[PDB]
Amino acid sequence: RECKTESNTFPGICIPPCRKACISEKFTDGHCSKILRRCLCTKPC
Amino acid sequence: ECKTESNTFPGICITKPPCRKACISEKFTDGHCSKILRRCLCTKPC
């Protein structure tokens, strides 16, 4: 299962700094969502 | 959507409503039990 949830520490709007925030939060990657422009973290779970 | 395990739901996910409740408290919009491990999974637009 891949878990995907918004970064808790990423500041502001998401348009690399997301990936960095997510790894800091112990996820394995991060990306920006297309519509809401949020930093979303992903990891195996 | 975002989809991840509920952090506050206690124990095994037997039926959906208590999982949905926990997920909504965690500011998701819905929850459901996983087929086999029967974990409570939360979902929301993201």
DSSP string, chain B: -EEEE-SS--S---SHHHHHHHHHHTT-SEEEE-SSS--EEEEE--
Structure tokens at A17: 């700094």
DSSP state of A26: T
What is the CATH number for A17?
3.30.30.10
Residue A6's H or E segment, with its range, is strand A2-6
- Residue A10's DSSP bridge partners are none
- Show the CA angle centred on residue A30, arms to residues A28 and A32, nearest 5°: 170
Q: Which residues of A touch B3 (CB under 8 A)?
A: 3-5
Domain count, chain A: 1
CA B20, CA B40: separation in Å to the nearest integer?
8
CA A38, CA A18: separation in Å to the nearest integer?
9
Experimentally, how was this structure solved? X-ray
- Resolution for this experimental structure (Å): 1.6
The domain in which residue B12 lies consists of 1-46
Closest Cα partner for B46 from B22, B27, B25, B20? B27
Residue in A with minimal Cα distance to B5: A3
CA B14, CA B31: separation in Å to the nearest integer?
12
Instruction: Indicate the residue of A36, A38, A45 with minimum beta-carbon distance to B4.
Output: A45
